[PDB]
Amino acid sequence: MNIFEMLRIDEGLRLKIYKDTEGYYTIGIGHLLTKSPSLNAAKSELDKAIGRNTNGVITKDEAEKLFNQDVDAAVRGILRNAKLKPVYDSLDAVRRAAAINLVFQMGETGVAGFTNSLRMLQQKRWDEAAVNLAKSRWYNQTPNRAKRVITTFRTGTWDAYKNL
Ligand SMILES: [Cl-]
Numbered sequence: 001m002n003i004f005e006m007l008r009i010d011e012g013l014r015l016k017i018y019k020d021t022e023g024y025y026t027i028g029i030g031h032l033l034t035k036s037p038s039l040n041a042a043k044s045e046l047d048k049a050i051g052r053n054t055n056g057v058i059t060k061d062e063a064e065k066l067f068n069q070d071v072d073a074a075v076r077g078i079l080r081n082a083k084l085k086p087v088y089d090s091l092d093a094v095r096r097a098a099a100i101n102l103v104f105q106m107g108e109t110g111v112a113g114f115t116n117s118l119r120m121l122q123q124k125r126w127d128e129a130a131v132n133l134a135k136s137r138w139y140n141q142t143p144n145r146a147k148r149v150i151t152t153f154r155t156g157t158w159d160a161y162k163n164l
């Protein structure tokens, strides 16, 4: 288990444009295309991302390429965030993966609302942080995924993923 395998489980793999949990056009392994209700706008974003006229369908290799880019950009974004970087740096590798997962899911919305949770994580108050993380729209809207991510933050193990 690593961040790629973890996010692949949480995001799934679809080769045609579909709507995510929030109703937004997405493709591949959790690659959000747009928040616009226009399918044509989503198709245009897809073409831009892939570099060809896709008409809403991609290959597995193309999906994996976007996924590599998206994971990389999530990590780089964390490191460029002056407030978030210290929290990330304080974590072990397994909990770092949980942080990348959350950042990936939140996308452009970001994680500023998680400030109190992130402080508790930095303090290594794992059970307290887990309780605080669940007091969120995130947990309520995607509780199974949030429970997996929270267990990863709480324990620093892959227990919520390894036996699926
Ligand atoms: Cl709390």
Ligand SMILES: [Cl-]
Binding pocket: 141, 142, 143, 144, 145, 146
């Ligand atoms: Cl869920």
Ligand SMILES: [K+]
Binding pocket: 010, 011, 012, 020, 021, 026, 029, 030
């Ligand atoms: K998804």
